[PDB]
């Protein structure tokens, strides 16, 4: 059916159809363009009008303009065909390399699995890095949120976490790129590239990629995050295969919303953001999840603006993950890579019946002497290191060494430290924490563990110390 | 309020500071004793 | 029967104030067309509402009025683009308002042109040279990148992006058209009287010949100054397109954000965080990612930006701030504090981070520029002391040595190799017997030395855009007799 | 063409026209009042009606009443006969002496200046005022604002650069009262009258007077600044002479415009200002410059609400300006005067190669002193100075010196000072400072710098002192 444009304000394109009206959530062709143009129906104004958000610019539309209902939602190309290719928000192939030949299209709107439908398996997920697999582990098929501030190192953890657990996947994984740069989203196809994650002459590619970038009109923001989702849920049903969903950066599909909210007549609710804010977020999050059909390991970024974690967007986001890890600012300054923040980083399957008791009594003794450090960083603020019992002073000692030894050098981050990004076993890690603990290590100087991997190299570069000297 | 004082400046630097200097020589003061060891 | 009205190509004006022009009509012009009204002013169509359209006065509206008739254009706004406007001023739309005549331009291009997507863009290598030791050294820049000067009002901002354009003479003069710069410098919401010296500086810099100010000064409507920016893109985009190398200056996204607020409220959509609309994020993203460094299939050129951003009790945790910050790849920090200490430039390198990092740095400098930046910033934390023990006291006392070896004069940039000749004066501890207060004196009398006597030793380092042994030798040997010399 | 009242809200006055429809700006005469009701066309809102705002009281208007168009925007009498006269927003005199012959009249909107007839001569303009002086020196021909909080400092200032500048002055000056006091203009008039500036009888004055009081309706105190600015703009141009143009306070432009905004029917922008602001000050700001064609040395008090510097109002003041003197209450409270922030006025001026290095390194070697010092008032707080090194106590005591080395005794304040008033020149005050800095002085007493003219009478006192 034929509608035709009765007005245009930015994103919010209002439609009218005289035939039949197009249900909430349709997909709709502007005719009369050299680029496809996509209108989402999001509302039913009412008198055969309907109001839609464009899934690009509205640069040119003219009142009046014709609009073919393509009959559904958006429908985009899913299936083993897109690996190695990069879509669009609408399907489309954006890499140059033609079309996407594909045998199935997919609604990037659907409903939530059911709960009868939910699985309660948990696995513990190695990474190699010890702060993560020691405080908050991460677990198989389970939802990963990285949460910072601007520049703290959410696009380089994920990236560790590609570069670490993606290419060692016995199966596929998918990439969305969600309001970021676009200069990213070159770095990461490239680099996919030649480790071979991407193979452009054959067809063993192993990751799929969506965008939908900052240059992009909100609209589009608004609905990659669920594109790039529906390209995962083909992998996780229709094969049950393990599948991993890297998203970088979720928050800008709440930006998205938050960029349109006003123009779909809707009051604003605390902080700007739309009122829908919580449940847009609901119905998105929950699609995202590891059913008893197959199970989907996912790792999203997640922004915190001006760093406040209470801001209602970060603050919404925290229950949609069974594992957090959170970057703080004061640690990064402090030049602690990955800037993870030891007291808030928090883990489902941080119990010793999952972990064993040995995992959990370190983590939980590295946590409480780190509370136990900043509780003298008030004290010797004022005082000096001269005034703590040998006893206290002794665990001020400990807890910089603890500290430092949680910073780990990322292969990924080669370019920036300058250092050979080392991979720690899981086992390594507690050793190396359960005996920093112990007080063994109190004759090495702090700086040995800095920037290292398993605890020997800790030895062995306060070795390479103590002759320098 | 754990450590609030750190995380603000004034007497941070300090903390840091004094914090930063006193490590700083105990490990020189560790370091050739490891040589002797 | 006059059918010059049939509102279809034309309109009629219905209500008009503020800067807004409701007008009935228009039938057929597209969302973003440009508009003509009665008075040969301009005008852009924002609204396209089904009783009206929404047209924003793109000038003095004083001579509009109900029933005005208003033409279409059949064009999406664009600008005259091409190296003709290269040294003259322009207004945002690209009309000469530096009195010199008409402008060559035989190209247009839309102000609102898409950016580059993934598969174009090649990784950023080439540098961008500010000439400005505290970045080149710290803050590397990279010709396809977006990096963001921010800070609170009088902290040398602008400064800044001034002695990096002047700092592109060297190579503009230069015989390697690779490493030619051409500089776009975009005035928002700025004064005039400000422009003036701008210009009249860059002209005392023999820089203006090959920079292209556009201008849109407080007293321009809105819309002139939202433009404004997208215009001085799409003139940066041009040479973009074409194996050549922008660098463009959007001199306050602040007050841009300010005229878009106030357009976007006279044009009745509800407003938002401090009032602004919804989409200010898409305001200044949609404009950075032009930025960017091409492939060699693409010509292999760039457009990389230095948008300025101004914060109030120095608040980089504030609406615009934050959404700015969040999409460039870092960020120059100035702070008044540093500034009255005496460190000017006034950057903070505690807060400022380059994304590219050594991606864009030449040998040498990377060589004695090595590990500086921590260092200083490790000088920091020896910093709160400032009986020292003699250790300590060294680290405190590299930090105030280089401290001073960093401080320049303006209009007088300096070539990648006598920065490496006098930095490395200092980085290789040579000058830690110095009395601070001695060390810019000392950069004098030095560098005039050098640029004397020894110009084949720099015509190496250059040449070489590395340290080679010999090299570090006759330096050594420099440095450290020179310096005697001066501490006679 | 008659044009009729359909609705009156405060200033804000919609007049309906049947033919012939006035252009913004354009001004339109109330009839059947007693005294002139000037309204300004600020919008066509449709239907053959236009949305103004009223010049004066609105009281007594009836819906139905006949509005003229003049044809043209408020135009006020410019030119030598307006010197020594007292004149409102739309060029009536106030000042009970009668009308004010001029040949011309001059609109009191217009274009600003345009991009070729900007000037870049940057020239000193010492004022005997060690703080600025020495910190942010003013600028012959430039724009220079005083910021400062409700009782603070604004005025004082803005009378005693009038007493140390305008008399020495070799032209004309324009004094725009905006939004203040009343009996203030009533004190200015009286003591320009003395000082003799201002001549009743023979035709020797030398200032012109524009006042638009708090007393007045948003539309009035929203324009007053323009017409002040207008008889600057003629004296400028229409003569090429320096012109002098204060303004007490040019905040009051911006909150006037804030109280008829409302009432326009615009959606409010942040902290409940027009979103106009920014566009609406500038299309003004423009226009008070100095051209090719003759110079405006201009000084204007803003006012800081609730204290607040980021207030849209004030922000959006300082890009305009070429100098500042920001004005604090906790440096007023320790009762230094001019409450000047040593760190936080700016001059464009402030450049080595313009006020030579020996002024420029002495200014910075000032606000070095005491920015260092500044951040040791967090240790100084809480732990006292025995935990301050000798290092740092020295830096605190020259500080101290310092602070009190740029208050100042002002003609216009011996009142409230007690001191008789001191005009200090800019060689004193560099050396004064070179010396403190130097350690010169680290014998005196604190109490022997504040307020005193040079540095010989910190001296003086502190023999005195013993
Ligand atoms: N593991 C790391 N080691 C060293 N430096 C790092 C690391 N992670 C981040 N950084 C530094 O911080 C910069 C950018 O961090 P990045 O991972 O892009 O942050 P981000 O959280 O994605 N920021 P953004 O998305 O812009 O809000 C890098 O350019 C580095 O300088
Ligand atoms: N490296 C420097 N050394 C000394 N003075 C400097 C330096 N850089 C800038 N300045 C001075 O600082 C003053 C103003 O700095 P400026 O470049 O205008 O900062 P800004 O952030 O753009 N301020 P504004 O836009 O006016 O709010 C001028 O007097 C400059 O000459
Ligand atoms: N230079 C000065 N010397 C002594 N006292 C001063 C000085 N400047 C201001 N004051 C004091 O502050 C008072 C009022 O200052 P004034 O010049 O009227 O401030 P203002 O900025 O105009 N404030 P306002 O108009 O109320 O917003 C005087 O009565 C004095 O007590
Ligand atoms: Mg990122
Ligand atoms: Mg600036
Ligand atoms: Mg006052």
């Known amino acids: ?469 | 309020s754990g450590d609030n004082v750190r995380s603000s400046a004034g007497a941070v630097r300090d903390a840091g500071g004094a914090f930063g200097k006193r490590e700083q020589a105990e490990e020189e003061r560790y370091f050739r004793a490891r040589a002797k060891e | 029967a006059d059918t010059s009205v049939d509102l279809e190509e034309t309109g009629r004006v219905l209500s008009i104030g503020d800067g807004i022009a409701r007008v009935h009509g228009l039938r057929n012009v597209q969302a973003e067309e440009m508009v003509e009204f009665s008075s040969g002013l301009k005008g852009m169509s924002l609204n396209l509402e089904p009783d009206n359209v929404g047209v924003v006065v793109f000038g003095n509206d004083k001579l509009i009025k109900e029933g005005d008739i208003v033409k279409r254009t059949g064009a999406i706004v664009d600008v005259p683009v091409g190296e003709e406007l290269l040294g003259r001023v322009v207004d945002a739309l690209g009309n000469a308002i530096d009195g010199k005549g008409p402008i060559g331009s035989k190209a247009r291009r839309r102000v609102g042109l898409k950016a580059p997507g993934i598969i174009p863009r090649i990784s950023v290598r080439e540098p961008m040279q500010t000439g400005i030791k505290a970045v080149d050294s710290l803050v590397p820049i990279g010709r396809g990148q977006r990096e963001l000067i921010i800070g609170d009002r009088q902290t040398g901002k602008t400064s800044i992006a001034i002695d990096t354009i002047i700092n592109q003479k060297r190579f503009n003069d230069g015989t390697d058209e690779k490493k030619k710069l051409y500089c776009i410098y975009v005035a928002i919401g700025q004064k005039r009287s400000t422009v003036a010296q701008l210009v009249k500086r860059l002209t005392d810099a023999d820089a203006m010949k090959y920079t292209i100010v556009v201008s849109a000064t407080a007293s321009d409507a809105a819309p002139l100054q939202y433009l404004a920016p997208y215009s001085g893109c799409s003139m940066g985009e041009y040479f973009r397109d074409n194996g050549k190398h922008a660098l463009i200056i959007y001199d306050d996204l602040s007050k841009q954000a300010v005229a878009y607020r106030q357009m976007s409220l006279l044009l009745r959509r509800p407003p938002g965080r401090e009032a602004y609309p919804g989409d200010v994020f898409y305001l200044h993203s949609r404009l950075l990612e032009r930025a960017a460094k091409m492939n060699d299939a693409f010509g292999g050129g760039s457009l990389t930006a230095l948008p300025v951003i101004e914060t109030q009790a120095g608040d980089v945790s504030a609406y615009i701030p934050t959404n700015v910050i969040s999409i460039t790849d870092g960020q120059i920090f100035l702070e008044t504090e540093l500034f009255y200490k005496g460190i000017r430039p006034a950057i903070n390198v505690g807060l400022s981070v380059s994304r590219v990092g050594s991606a864009a740095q030449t040998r040498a400098m990377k060589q004695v520029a090595g590990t500086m930046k921590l260092e200083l910033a490790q000088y920091r934390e020896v910093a709160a002391f400032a009986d020292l023990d003699a250790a300590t006291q060294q680290l405190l006392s590299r930090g105030v040595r280089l401290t001073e070896l960093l401080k320049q004069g303006q209009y007088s940039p300096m070539a990648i190799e006598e920065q490496v000749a006098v930095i490395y004066a200092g980085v290789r501890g040579y000058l830690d017997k110095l009395e601070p207060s001695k060390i810019t004196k000392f950069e004098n009398a030095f560098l005039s030395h050098v640029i004397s006597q020894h110009q084949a030793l720099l015509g190496k380092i250059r040449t070489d855009g590395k340290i080679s042994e010999e090299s570090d030798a006759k330096l050594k040997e420099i440095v450290t007799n020179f310096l005697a010399g001066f501490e006679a």
Do not use: C, W
């Open chain 1, 1 to 469: 059916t034929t509608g035709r444009i009765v007005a245009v304000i930015g994103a919010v394109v209002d439609v009218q159809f005289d035939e039949g009206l197009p249900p909430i959530l349709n997909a709709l062709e502007v005719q009369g363009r050299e680029t496809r143009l996509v209108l989402e129906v999001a509302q039913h104004l009412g008198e055969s009008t309907v109001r839609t958000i464009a899934m690009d610019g509205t640069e040119g539309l003219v009142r009046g303009q014709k609009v073919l209902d393509s009959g559904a939602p958006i429908r985009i190309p899913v299936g083993p065909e897109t690996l190695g290719r990069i879509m669009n928000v609408i399907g489309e192939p954006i890499d140059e390399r033609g079309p996407i030949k594909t045998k199935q299209f997919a609604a990037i709107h659907a409903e939530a699995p059911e709960f009868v439908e939910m699985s309660v398996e948990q696995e513990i997920l190695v990474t190699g890095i010890k702060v993560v697999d020691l405080l908050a582990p991460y677990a198989k098929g389970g939802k990963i949120g990285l949460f910072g501030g601007a520049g703290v190192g959410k696009t380089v953890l994920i990236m560790e976490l590609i570069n670490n657990v993606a290419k060692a996947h016995g199966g596929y994984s998918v990439f969305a790129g969600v309001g970021e740069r676009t200069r990213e989203g070159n770095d990461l196809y490239h680099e996919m590239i030649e480790s071979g994650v991407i193979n452009l002459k054959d067809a063993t590619s192993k990751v799929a990629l969506v965008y939908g970038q900052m240059n992009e009109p909100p609209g589009a923001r608004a609905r990659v995050a669920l594109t790039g989702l529906t390209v995962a849920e083909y992998f996780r049903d229709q094969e049950g295969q393990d599948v991993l969903l890297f998203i970088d950066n979720i928050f800008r599909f709440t930006q998205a919303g938050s960029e349109v909210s006003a123009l779909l007549g809707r009051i604003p609710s605390a902080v700007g953001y739309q009122p829908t804010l919580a449940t847009d977020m609901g119905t998105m999050q929950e699609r995202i999840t590891t059913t008893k059909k197959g199970s989907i390991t996912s790792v999203q970024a997640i922004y915190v603006p001006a760093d406040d974690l209470t801001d209602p967007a970060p603050a919404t986001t925290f229950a949609h993950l069974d594992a957090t890890t959170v970057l703080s600012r004061a640690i990064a300054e402090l030049g602690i890579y990955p800037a993870v923040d030891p007291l808030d980083s928090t883990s489902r399957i941080m119990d010793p019946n999952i972990v064993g008791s040995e995992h959990y009594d370190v983590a939980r003794g590295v946590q409480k002497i780190l509370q136990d450090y900043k509780s003298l960083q008030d004290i010797i603020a004022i005082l000096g290191m001269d005034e703590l019992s040998e006893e206290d002073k002794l665990t001020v000692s400990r807890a910089r060494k603890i500290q430092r030894f949680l910073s780990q050098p990322f292969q990924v981050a080669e370019v920036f430290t300058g250092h050979l990004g080392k991979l720690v076993p899981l086992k390594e890690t507690i050793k190396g924490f359960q005996q920093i603990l112990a007080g063994e290590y109190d004759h090495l100087p702090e700086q040995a563990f800095y920037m290292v991997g398993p605890i020997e190299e800790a030895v062995a570069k306060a070795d390479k110390l103590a002759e320098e000297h």
